[PDB]
């Protein structure tokens, strides 16, 4: 997360770390047994880490659970990053508490100019390499589709939105792929891509979760 702040420990209780010997992506807890992340975060042998703040120290609140199953969206295109969404089933149910909570699925899509919260652990620098150990946060509006498609001509589909600032400086890219974008108490986004990091007229590009709620509910209930 470039150009934000330290959330505070356990202030984003739905935030998940996907670990494969190291932290490689974020995710969101949508119920005791399921996580949603990005399809470009697909690996084998994932461990899901809940209740984290500092990913390098065991601060007491953690829950470490092996993933039993991963489901990538049937229409995921890894070239265009269209339908960049994946579902991860926990081997054992998470124990929900003050620090470990679910986030709700949208009943409807969010509109432009709606403020959202984007959280994650990744690269804080637009130029160079600096990985934070603690959860970071950014508040950013959803930009209008016009403003989005203009920044990435012929790259943006219906299943994407942009958030942040047209001037750059503040963005998420490498700053946690797969991470949540929460607007008015609902999961509206997943950190998908963005050209460079926090560049001028290069916003972040998010998977538009409200398009997928039917897929998510049908998949989860059948698996
Ligand atoms: Ca920790």
UniProtKB/Swiss-Prot annotation:
Biological process (GO), any one: digestion
Tissue specificity of this protein: Synthesized in the acinar cells of the pancreas.
InterPro entries in UniProt: Peptidase_S1_PA (IPR009003), Peptidase_S1_PA_chymotrypsin (IPR043504), Peptidase_S1A (IPR001314), Serine_Proteases_S1 (IPR050127), Trypsin_dom (IPR001254), TRYPSIN_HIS (IPR018114), TRYPSIN_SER (IPR033116)
Disulfide-bond pairs as recorded: 7-137, 25-41, 109-210, 116-183, 148-162, 173-197
Phylogenetic lineage: Eukaryota, Metazoa, Chordata, Craniata, Vertebrata
Cofactor note: Binds 1 Ca(2+) ion per subunit.
Protein family (similarity comment): Belongs to the peptidase S1 family.
Active-site feature positions: 40 (charge relay system), 84 (charge relay system), 177 (charge relay system)
Complex and partners: Interacts with SERPINA1.
Keywords: Calcium, Digestion, Disulfide bond, Hydrolase, Metal-binding, Protease, Secreted, Serine protease, Signal, Zymogen
SUPFAM superfamilies: Trypsin-like serine proteases (SSF50494)
Activity regulation text: Is inhibited by scorpion cyclotide trypsin inhibitor TopI1.
Binding-site positions, substrate: 171-172, 174-175, 177
E.C. number(s) listed in UniProt: 3.4.21.4
EC class (word): hydrolase
Name of this protein: Serine protease 1
PANTHER family linked: RIKEN CDNA 2210010C04 GENE, TRYPSIN-RELATED
Subcellular location: Secreted, Extracellular space
Binding site for Ca(2+): 52, 54, 57, 62
Record domain Peptidase S1: where: 1-221
Domain of life: Eukaryota
PTMs per UniProt: Subsequent cleavage after Lys-125 leads to alpha-trypsin. Further cleavage after Lys-170 yields pseudotrypsin. A cleavage may also occur after Arg-99. Not sulfated on tyrosine residue(s).
A GO MF label: metal ion binding
Species of origin: Bos taurus (Bovine)
Record's GO cellular component terms: extracellular space; serine protease inhibitor complex
